[PDB]
Design an enzyme around this catalytic site. Sequence first.
Site, PDB file in Angstrom:
ATOM      1  CG  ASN A 209      15.876 -11.757 -34.025  1.00 55.18           C
ATOM      2  OD1 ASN A 209      16.265 -11.158 -34.727  1.00 55.18           O
ATOM      3  ND2 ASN A 209      17.128 -12.191 -33.165  1.00 55.18           N
TER       4      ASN A 209
ATOM      5  CG  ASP B 162      14.702  -9.149 -33.266  1.00 57.26           C
ATOM      6  OD1 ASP B 162      13.656  -9.809 -33.001  1.00 57.26           O
ATOM      7  OD2 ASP B 162      15.486  -8.753 -32.391  1.00 57.26           O
TER       8      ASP B 162
ATOM      9  CG  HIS C  86      11.465  -1.545 -33.083  1.00 53.96           C
ATOM     10  ND1 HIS C  86      11.236  -1.682 -34.358  1.00 53.96           N
ATOM     11  CD2 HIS C  86      12.596  -2.176 -32.737  1.00 53.96           C
ATOM     12  CE1 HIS C  86      11.974  -2.528 -34.896  1.00 53.96           C
ATOM     13  NE2 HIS C  86      12.990  -2.709 -33.948  1.00 53.96           N
TER      14      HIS C  86
ATOM     15  CG  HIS D   5      16.014  -1.806 -37.954  1.00 55.66           C
ATOM     16  ND1 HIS D   5      17.346  -1.117 -37.485  1.00 55.66           N
ATOM     17  CD2 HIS D   5      15.815  -2.698 -37.163  1.00 55.66           C
ATOM     18  CE1 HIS D   5      17.859  -1.940 -36.491  1.00 55.66           C
ATOM     19  NE2 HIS D   5      16.879  -2.764 -36.420  1.00 55.66           N
TER      20      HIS D   5
ATOM     21  CD  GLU E 180      16.472  -6.447 -40.187  1.00 51.99           C
ATOM     22  OE1 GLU E 180      16.382  -5.326 -39.526  1.00 51.99           O
ATOM     23  OE2 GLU E 180      16.778  -7.397 -39.599  1.00 51.99           O
TER      24      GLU E 180
ATOM     25  CG  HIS F 144      18.739 -10.399 -40.077  1.00 56.84           C
ATOM     26  ND1 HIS F 144      18.697  -9.945 -38.430  1.00 56.84           N
ATOM     27  CD2 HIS F 144      19.950 -11.336 -39.742  1.00 56.84           C
ATOM     28  CE1 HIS F 144      19.773 -10.212 -37.891  1.00 56.84           C
ATOM     29  NE2 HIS F 144      20.650 -11.089 -38.568  1.00 56.84           N
TER      30      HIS F 144
ATOM     31  CD  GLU G  32      20.417  -7.083 -37.921  1.00 51.41           C
ATOM     32  OE1 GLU G  32      19.109  -7.125 -37.651  1.00 51.41           O
ATOM     33  OE2 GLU G  32      21.233  -7.490 -36.977  1.00 51.41           O
TER      34      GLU G  32
ATOM     35  CD  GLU H  24      20.964  -2.704 -33.958  1.00 54.10           C
ATOM     36  OE1 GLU H  24      20.974  -3.859 -33.457  1.00 54.10           O
ATOM     37  OE2 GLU H  24      20.424  -2.568 -35.237  1.00 54.10           O
ATOM     38  CE1 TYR H  25      25.317   3.057 -27.171  1.00 51.55           C
ATOM     39  CE2 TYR H  25      27.058   2.169 -25.702  1.00 51.55           C
ATOM     40  CZ  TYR H  25      26.217   3.108 -25.992  1.00 51.55           C
ATOM     41  OH  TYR H  25      25.769   4.456 -25.101  1.00 51.55           O
ATOM     42  CB  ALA H  26      24.867  -1.011 -24.082  1.00 51.44           C
ATOM     43  CG  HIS H  27      21.205  -6.831 -26.733  1.00 49.00           C
ATOM     44  ND1 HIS H  27      20.249  -7.860 -26.295  1.00 49.00           N
ATOM     45  CD2 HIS H  27      20.287  -6.441 -27.916  1.00 49.00           C
ATOM     46  CE1 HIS H  27      19.236  -8.195 -26.896  1.00 49.00           C
ATOM     47  NE2 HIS H  27      19.380  -7.321 -27.899  1.00 49.00           N
TER      48      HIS H  27
ATOM     49  CG  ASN I  19       7.934 -18.508 -30.259  1.00 43.94           C
ATOM     50  OD1 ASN I  19       8.695 -18.543 -29.204  1.00 43.94           O
ATOM     51  ND2 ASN I  19       7.401 -19.551 -30.233  1.00 43.94           N
TER      52      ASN I  19
ATOM     53  CG  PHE J   5      16.222 -13.093 -28.100  1.00 43.17           C
ATOM     54  CD1 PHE J   5      17.291 -12.454 -28.196  1.00 43.17           C
ATOM     55  CD2 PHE J   5      16.348 -14.339 -27.667  1.00 43.17           C
ATOM     56  CE1 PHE J   5      18.505 -12.764 -27.600  1.00 43.17           C
ATOM     57  CE2 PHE J   5      17.264 -15.319 -27.382  1.00 43.17           C
ATOM     58  CZ  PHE J   5      18.577 -14.236 -27.308  1.00 43.17           C
TER      59      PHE J   5
ATOM     60  CG  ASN K 230      15.922  -6.945 -27.247  1.00 42.40           C
ATOM     61  OD1 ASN K 230      15.719  -6.655 -28.409  1.00 42.40           O
ATOM     62  ND2 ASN K 230      16.092  -7.987 -26.632  1.00 42.40           N
TER      63      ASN K 230
ATOM     64  CD1 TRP L  82      24.718 -12.923 -30.658  1.00 37.94           C
ATOM     65  CD2 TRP L  82      23.365 -11.572 -29.638  1.00 37.94           C
ATOM     66  NE1 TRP L  82      25.263 -11.820 -30.851  1.00 37.94           N
ATOM     67  CE2 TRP L  82      24.107 -10.846 -30.535  1.00 37.94           C
ATOM     68  CE3 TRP L  82      22.170 -10.854 -28.984  1.00 37.94           C
ATOM     69  CZ2 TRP L  82      23.921  -9.340 -30.635  1.00 37.94           C
ATOM     70  CZ3 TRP L  82      22.108  -9.429 -29.090  1.00 37.94           C
ATOM     71  CH2 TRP L  82      22.878  -8.754 -30.061  1.00 37.94           C
TER      72      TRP L  82
HETATM   73 MG    MG Z   1      17.583  -8.408 -37.780  1.00 40.05          MG
HETATM   74 NA    NA Z   2      15.354  -8.385 -30.007  1.00 39.04          NA
END
Ligand code: MG
Ligand code: NA
EC number: 3.2.1.23
Lengths: 1011, 1011
Positions: B90, B189, B345, B379, B404, B406, B449, B525-528, B585, B589, B592, B987
Amino acid sequence: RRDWENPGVTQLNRLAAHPPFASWRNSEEARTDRPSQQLRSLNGEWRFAWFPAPEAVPESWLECDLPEADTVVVPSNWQMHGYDAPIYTNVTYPITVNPPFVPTENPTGCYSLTFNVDESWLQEGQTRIIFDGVNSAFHLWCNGRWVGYGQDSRLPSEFDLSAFLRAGENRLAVMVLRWSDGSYLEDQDMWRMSGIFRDVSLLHKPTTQISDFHVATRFNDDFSRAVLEAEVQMCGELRDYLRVTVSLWQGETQVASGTAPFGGEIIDERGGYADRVTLRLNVENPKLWSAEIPNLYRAVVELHTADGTLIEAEACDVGFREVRIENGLLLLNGKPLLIRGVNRHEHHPLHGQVMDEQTMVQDILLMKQNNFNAVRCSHYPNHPLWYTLCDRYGLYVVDEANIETHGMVPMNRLTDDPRWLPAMSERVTRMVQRDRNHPSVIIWSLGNESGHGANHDALYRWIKSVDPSRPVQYEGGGADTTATDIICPMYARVDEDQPFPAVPKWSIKKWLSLPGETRPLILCEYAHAMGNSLGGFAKYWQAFRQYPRLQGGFVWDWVDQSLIKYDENGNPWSAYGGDFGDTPNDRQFCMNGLVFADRTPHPALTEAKHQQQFFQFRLSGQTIEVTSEYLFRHSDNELLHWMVALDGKPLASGEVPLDVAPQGKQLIELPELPQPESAGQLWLTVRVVQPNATAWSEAGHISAWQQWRLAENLSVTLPAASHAIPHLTTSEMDFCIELGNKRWQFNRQSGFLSQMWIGDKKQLLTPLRDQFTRAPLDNDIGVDEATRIDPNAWVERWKAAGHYQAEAALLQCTADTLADAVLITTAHAWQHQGKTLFISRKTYRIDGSGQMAITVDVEVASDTPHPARIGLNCQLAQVAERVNWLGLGPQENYPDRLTAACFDRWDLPLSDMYTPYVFPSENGLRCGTRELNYGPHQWRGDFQFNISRYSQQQLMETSHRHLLHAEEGTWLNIDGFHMGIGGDDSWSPSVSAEFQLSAGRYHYQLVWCQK
Amino acid sequence: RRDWENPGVTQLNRLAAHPPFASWRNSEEARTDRPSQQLRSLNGEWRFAWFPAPEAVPESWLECDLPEADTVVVPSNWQMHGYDAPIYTNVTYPITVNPPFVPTENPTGCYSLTFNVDESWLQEGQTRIIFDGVNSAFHLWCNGRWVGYGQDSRLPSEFDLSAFLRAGENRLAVMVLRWSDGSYLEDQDMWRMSGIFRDVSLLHKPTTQISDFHVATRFNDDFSRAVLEAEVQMCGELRDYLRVTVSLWQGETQVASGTAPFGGEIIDERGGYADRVTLRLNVENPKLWSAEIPNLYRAVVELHTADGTLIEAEACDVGFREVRIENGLLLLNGKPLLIRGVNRHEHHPLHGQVMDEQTMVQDILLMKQNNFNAVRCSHYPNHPLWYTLCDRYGLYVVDEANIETHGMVPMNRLTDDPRWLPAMSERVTRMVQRDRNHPSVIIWSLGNESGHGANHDALYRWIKSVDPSRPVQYEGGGADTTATDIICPMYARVDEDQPFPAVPKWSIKKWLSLPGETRPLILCEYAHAMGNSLGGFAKYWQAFRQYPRLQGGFVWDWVDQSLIKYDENGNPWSAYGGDFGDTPNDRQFCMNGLVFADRTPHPALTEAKHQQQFFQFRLSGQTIEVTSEYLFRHSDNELLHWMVALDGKPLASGEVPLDVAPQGKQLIELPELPQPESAGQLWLTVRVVQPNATAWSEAGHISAWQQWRLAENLSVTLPAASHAIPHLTTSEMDFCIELGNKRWQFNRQSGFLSQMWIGDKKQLLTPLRDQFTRAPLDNDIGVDEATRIDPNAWVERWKAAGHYQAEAALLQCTADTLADAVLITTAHAWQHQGKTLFISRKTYRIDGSGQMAITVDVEVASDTPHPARIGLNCQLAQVAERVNWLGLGPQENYPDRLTAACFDRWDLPLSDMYTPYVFPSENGLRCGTRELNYGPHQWRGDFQFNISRYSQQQLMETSHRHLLHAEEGTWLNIDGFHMGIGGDDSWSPSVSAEFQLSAGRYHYQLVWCQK
Ligand SMILES: [Mg+2]
Ligand code: NA
Ligand SMILES: [Mg+2]
Ligand SMILES: [Mg+2]
Ligand SMILES: [Mg+2]
Ligand SMILES: [Mg+2]
Ligand SMILES: [Mg+2]
Ligand SMILES: [Mg+2]
Ligand SMILES: [Mg+2]
Ligand code: NA
Ligand code: NA
Ligand code: NA
Ligand code: NA
Ligand code: NA
Ligand code: NA
Ligand code: NA
């Protein structure tokens, strides 16, 4: 890989940019700015070989000195040693425009040095080499092994040599290319040279080191409280024992100190910078920095263990000042600036583009002595010492990125191209990283003459983001784009619009108030000082003072870019474009300075000094009102000297202390002045004198002056009745007049006075004739070429109308005997191709006193271009040592450049009456003259004159001052009227209407007598 | 030179970026978008060899095929062919963080192809090769000769092969590196793969060519007039006879056209672009583009001669639309958008990151069918076909730069560093250059990110300068920085603040009105949607509808990133992080999605569809008010069906066409409904049906639904009197109750119903016991792992409190015989380490009708974490085929995710009552259930339930769905109460207070009987 033909590669293995480092290992040495043992100079004698291309360089050179190499001084430009020619071109690139390619014939300079490195430097830490300036691109090898590559001629390139060096003897090899892809961004109007032209140094840093530091100063509303914020970054071994201490010193007194461990505030989801720390120091009642009072503190940045071991120290001069734009005004410490600026290239007539401390100091002293307070780094970052000197002496600085693409078509072809963004970004970002701690730098510039492209917008925003403390300006694409905080035009006129398509140059007064416009306006270039120029300079200064948002400008420019060449006898002479076989070239366009290359002033410098005065004066009856234009300082080193004189004869004088607050006023009532019985004009002259020496001036320095006419008593007394009457003798060819020991001869075929005698001695080598032309000034010529005629230039209008070839036709020539005089009456017409250009009607009255009164009335055809002058000229038989006059002086002055000149009795050697402009032209005029004395002659009237050993014809026909030869006797030009010289620019007509000779009919009168 | 470890080198010899080209040589083929013979695909069978590092690649490979190589399909990711392992990480980089260096072991993919070209391509013109996607960096050779280098895995790299091509067979050699300095900017991610994973093509252009074109559309105030402005750039030799024509087509009709020679307007002192021209076309009453009605025109750009010879043509689809932010609102064609978005993605379970048309179309269809109108390219720039499909099907697109970082500490370490500005700039600039003509792209994003750095501000400004037609957004550094036009947070909650240092996530309602804030807010981003998720989704939609400046968001995310693996028998299973030996790893995750990898919907998709409906409904009396949320379209493909049912039994129904203008209302009065005297609740269900098929939906597509309770008639009738009386038998160990052939056994040691019999047949395999726990959902777990415990996660709180380990201590167990019934009373205490967590008090009443009434009263200690559920569970002996229930369905629903579910009589196969989440957890709950039928059993009350072959214990202990085994009989969980599932993120605890079981005392009742 031909990295020099790839704008995607601007460096290889080059270290990050940073503020000046010295890596002191003793904090007191850092505080005092004393030399650091960890910073060595590699300047001196190097080995050098020239090649026509990088492909011609032998591989052996990497390992071994070339036997055919010479020993030369570094820093140097190799053109200055004669290896190839310097090229002067203005706009047109010196290479074929084919980006990113350069010529296959690419002059290559192979520099090498054998030098010592102490064992101690290699036992620990990091040894780096720093090249402050390499033009234009270079590869570096150390002990035969390749290190890296660098571009951008005007910023330091640094390389880590730790893994390449051995104790004792080491050898550097530097291959310098004259042309690279970087050359496309280096099209400044200057000599095109190359080489290792700034300092080379070796710097030792510890493994754990200060890698960057930024100093900021923020203030409360009235500037009585400040916070110094110092952000410090480290590289190397990050440990909990590490600390930074920042201490602030005012001389020997520590005023503030702060200590902290590393680890900045949290900035995002991943945390903060563990390798950074920000120290905040409170400073009460800080002494503020300005150009007026350059108050400085010393900040010492100590990297150390908590328990007291200094790892290393870095330091800088700190000037507490805020620069901000508010409500349309550029403010410094809350007050609106008036920029008395000049553009300054780095130029030396012998050393080319190599700068030395002595030359820099000389320039700064002369600038300050002439009332300048600001300098623009046209058009690249300067030698690092420049900013230190500006910090300490006090000058505001515009720091400018080394980006100019003038020769592109259109000008933004590269700057709008995202593929050139990387190359441009480096020239902006590395400048800011280097220079951001200098208080003298108040404004950032994105470069010069590169149009307006999206890359400018991107980089404008970058600077605003990383350094909110300074405005960003940029002139390209019309001077008021989205990439500039300041409207910063070049050569916009005061009142006259120049409505060019897309990029108009509005009147500066008009520009401010265009719909929606709110920004301040400061000209990045104005008053083009090419040759005999700066006409109309006063008009700019009146506008600057009247309009709050007109905040000044930077004159173009400081110093002539002439170079020294040597004749067959070994005598030096000043050379310009084309004099090195460089072609194409732009001839004398490299010489635009207020001073000659050797820093001798042009006459225009005094006009700048006067208009840029910091005290303003008004006269009301007996009272002088003095107003200070200083923003911060009281007049604590100033006295006012005053003098009243009757036609140059001193009558009364005094001195009064000046006690004026900034922006304040002082009233000075003059003592009772006795009314003189004698005829003439009373003149009042005031001067501001600095009694005490300063860092930048000597005791007795004059900083300001002004003059007023007081009472005038017109002469009403008649001359004593003459005893004798002049005798006339007539023949077909001549009228001859005799009185006592004097004789006059008028030629009846030509209609001119052809000879005069005093006693037995003849006085004239050429007859006294009308003159309507001048040897053209640079402003009269513009971009006019023999191969490329510009019909709008004054010289071309005069030539086309036949002003220079017009022949006098005699219309009338008569003589009359009066009761006490002989009267000669003449009329001439000047014609070209059947067109009458001018008519001159004269009387000459020779009376029993021996005086000759000349009356001249001239008609000028309304449809001929207005003439350069309306006057008389002759070649006098005598050469005298001195010239004495009552009128404006002592220096050269013209109708649109005479404000600095004062009316008085002046007396100079003949040679001072000639101004040695490198490109010869009309020169040396003095205006407003009522009396002129030379040898046995006196001329009285109200006239302008010049006097020299050079005819207008010779000046017109000679390209260089060193080629002039003194003629027999003395050439005298006496003008009733003379055209302005102009200078708003030097490539279009710039003489304002009120200084053109457009009246159609002109009258003047002179008396010629023996003194 | 190791160009892959140098961020200053992102390419060598790469051609400029540009919009999609096909070099059509026939204008009609360009208009119709048919194939061009000048554009060839090189997709198909290539030769491939894998190496551990570039140093291991033999020189011979450049000249000829390696015998050891395999034949593989291109495009592909080489991990999907099994050459090495895909890595799922991630945040943490898959390589040691040491910029710009990568591991010396750097998997290297050597691709080669033998090919030939048309004779005419060898004759004249420019032949380029286009690699649409190579991960992560590559060198290219043609016929053994080096061509160039490229980075950025997500944009096309193009190279001129003209000078490399030869008659007959040619050979391409492509060396692809897994890791490069580019990898530092590619820390998304997702699975980390490599190879030539997008199309490879050859394009033959003329030497005199269209090199770029930009299309812009500007409008008047009411959109009744437009100007289409087309800027066209050429490369090659300028000739006076050259022209450009831009023509606009509406199907087969040419609506506008403009023709001009080259030569743009003057732009600066050097002129204009001689190699550009801008055409302006007036368009009256243009059909406007929106996601609702994707009206498109065709623009054809012709480079031709004045006398009519075509040189070449390019073309694009044109959508007339204006995107602007005004008064704090994002407007499309003057109307405020409501973004029903999803992040997507590019992922395929078999092909990895290779995209195909079929999968893209499948995704768009499913998105539109589920009421999405927008997609974020998370992304990176997508495969070029994606934008064409979004243009034509109608979806709003956020196009996002492939940046990115991150895993950096802090997140902006690279993005605030000017040395990384060049690499970043190309990722932004080349995206804009490629995609700027697509109407579906309405917003540019600077990446994801990467914190907030000065490089972001610079590139924000660059986009605004070059393309003023689209807003720029960026979430990094707190979601409301100077680098974003839109407040675009990720996982900001509706009402709850998350006041993190530096980067707080405010309540979205609060964020809007922070002092000085004016911008629109759209969550990037919302509502994972990780596993059993989307709890509280309705809360977002209520807020979006109420607040003008809350303009929606993009759900995270569309599709699970699971990969297919095969077991010993060859059977496929869904794999996540760690399943390929990849370490470190981030396990599950990567999953999603709203849909599984094969595009089968998760239950959460229906909740999204329902909340994102375009029609809103209100009921008042018998009047249904329908309000359209469409901005542009009339309801011209909509029919409203209504139906009234009594406890699942249909009573009345009908249909009415919808005739509602955008933003309009329609009133529908329901007819006189017959009042049923039969007791129960009447329910009204409405659904909007689309009678006609569209490009994106079948005939009969349901787009919206809603339910209301109508009249309820409570039952007051007593049940029929008992014929018999149950008999009690007592022993120390058991209470046994018998009635007819039915028996109930209560264990007196445990206090639970341990067995039931119908005749000789046992009904239970496990006793009926209280249950207070659930197999933890992904939202219950968060970032909690065996190596690093997170004590704040719900699962960790439950574990620490002993909820999973609690043992039932029996406090009371009594039996009483009543007049017509036997009554069993029990009380239990669940304790852990001496602490009482829960007390359960029950009565079981078994009457003469054979029904068992269970009353349950539970006490929960106030200081224990709120329990996951309060219910009963048992393992039934029976396995039956169907499950029939009266309650919410038909799909899985939870207390905070049940708005989409409808109350009715549902009947599904048993397998449908299990949701096959790849990571097993509590699943398949149905809420608001009044009656449940399974085999001979009926339960009645008001409960939530799930029913399956898997125990909570097995689900809890099993990491992958394929490892689950059906247990003996059927596990039944019946809950009086169940905790919310949450999902604002996955999370941290995300279940809102109102869905936590915090009441302290709980009551429920059930009746168990035989049907
Ligand atoms: Mg990221
Ligand atoms: Na993810
Ligand atoms: Mg280069
Ligand atoms: Mg100390
Ligand atoms: Mg030692
Ligand atoms: Mg220039
Ligand atoms: Mg004056
Ligand atoms: Mg690289
Ligand atoms: Mg509902
Ligand atoms: Na002013
Ligand atoms: Na010049
Ligand atoms: Na004083
Ligand atoms: Na001359
Ligand atoms: Na809204
Ligand atoms: Na309809
Ligand atoms: Na599990």
